[PDB]
Amino acid sequence: IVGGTASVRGEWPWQVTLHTTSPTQRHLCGGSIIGNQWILTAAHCFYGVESPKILRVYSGILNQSEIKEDTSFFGVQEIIIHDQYKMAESGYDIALLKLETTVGYGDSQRPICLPSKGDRNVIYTDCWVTGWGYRKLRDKIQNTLQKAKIPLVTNEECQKRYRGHKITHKMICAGYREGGKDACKGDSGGPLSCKHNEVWHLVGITSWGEGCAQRERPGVYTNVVEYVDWILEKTQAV
Numbered sequence: 001i002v003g004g005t006a007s008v009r010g011e012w013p014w015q016v017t018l019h020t021t022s023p024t025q026r027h028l029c030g031g032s033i034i035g036n037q038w039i040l041t042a043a044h045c046f047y048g049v050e051s052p053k054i055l056r057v058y059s060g061i062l063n064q065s066e067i068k069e070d071t072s073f074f075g076v077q078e079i080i081i082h083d084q085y086k087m088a089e090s091g092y093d094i095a096l097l098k099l100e101t102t103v104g105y106g107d108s109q110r111p112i113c114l115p116s117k118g119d120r121n122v123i124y125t126d127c128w129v130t131g132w133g134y135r136k137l138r139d140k141i142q143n144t145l146q147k148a149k150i151p152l153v154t155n156e157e158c159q160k161r162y163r164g165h166k167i168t169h170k171m172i173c174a175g176y177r178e179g180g181k182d183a184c185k186g187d188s189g190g191p192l193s194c195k196h197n198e199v200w201h202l203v204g205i206t207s208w209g210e211g212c213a214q215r216e217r218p219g220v221y222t223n224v225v226e227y228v229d230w231i232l233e234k235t236q237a238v
C-alpha cells in the first residue's frame with residue numbers, strides 16, 4: 001500500500017495473507033474470507049503454482065512477524081480459477097481457495113459480505129484497499145497490515161486513464177487523480193472493502209495498475225458484484 005497507515009488489530013478481519021512454501025516460505029498475495037471454508041483472491045496469484053499443497057492461509061494476522069513455523073494456518077484443498085481467466089489486464093482475475101478445514105469465526109477473523117446484485121447501482125464513498133505490499137515501487141513486504149481510503153473511479157474515467165487497455169464493467173477502478181494512495185506489489189488478491197449502511201462489502205479484488213499510486217493511473221480491481229453468481233456457483237454447488 002502506497003500512502004497508507006498501519007491498521008489496528010481486528011480492523012479488517014476478512015483480510016488474509018496467502019503464503020507459498022516453494023522454494024522457501026513467503027507472503028504471496030492477499031485474500032478475503034467470504035465463507036467458513038472459502039477465500040476470495042486474484043487468479044494471477046497462482047501463476048506457476050502447480051499444487052495447492054504449497055499454499056498456507058493465515059487469518060487473524062496484523063503483523064507478518066506473528067507468522068513462525070508454530071503459527072497455525074489453513075491448508076488449501078482446491079484452487080478454483082475462473083475459466084475465462086487469461087491474465088489480470090484482460091479481467092476474470094478471480095479465484096476461490098477451498099480450505100481443508102473450517103475457519104472458526106471470531107473478532108480476529110470473520111467474513112466480509114459480498115455486494116448485492118441490487119447494489120450495482122449504489123455509489124460507494126467509503127472504500128479501503130488493504131495489504132502487506134510495498135509502500136513504494138522498490139521496497140519490501142510490510143510487517144503491519146497497511147490501509148488506504150481510496151475513491152472509486154467510473155469506468156469511463158478509468159478507460160481514459162488506460163489508453164491501450166479495454167477497461168470492462170467486470171473491472172472497477174479506484175485512485176486519486178494526483179496519485180499518492182494505492183495498492184502496490186504484494187497487495188494483489190486482497191480486498192477493496194467499502195462500508196455502506198454500516199456494513200462492509202467486498203467491492204473489489206486488488207488486481208493490477210501501471211506502476212503504483214501514479215497520477216492518472218487508478219488501481220484496477222476485479223468488480224466483485226459482477227461475479228456473485230460465479231462465486232455462488234462454485235461455493236453452493238450441490
Ligand SMILES: COC(=O)Nc1ccc2c(c1)NC(=O)C[C@@H](C)/C=C/C[C@H](NC(=O)c1c(F)cc(C)cc1F)c1nc-2c(Cl)[nH]1
Pocket residue numbers: 026027028029044045046047133140141182183184185186187188189206207208209210211212213219220
Ligand atoms: C518476502 O515476501 C515477499 O517479498 N513477497 C512478495 C512481494 C511482492 C509480490 C509478491 C510477493 N507476489 C508475487 O510476486 C506473486 C505474483 C503472482 C503477483 C504479481 C503481481 C502483484 N502485483 C501487485 O500486488 C499490484 C497490484 F495488485 C496492484 C497495483 C496497482 C500494483 C501492484 F504491484 C505483485 N505481487 C508482488 C509483486 Cl513484485 N507484484
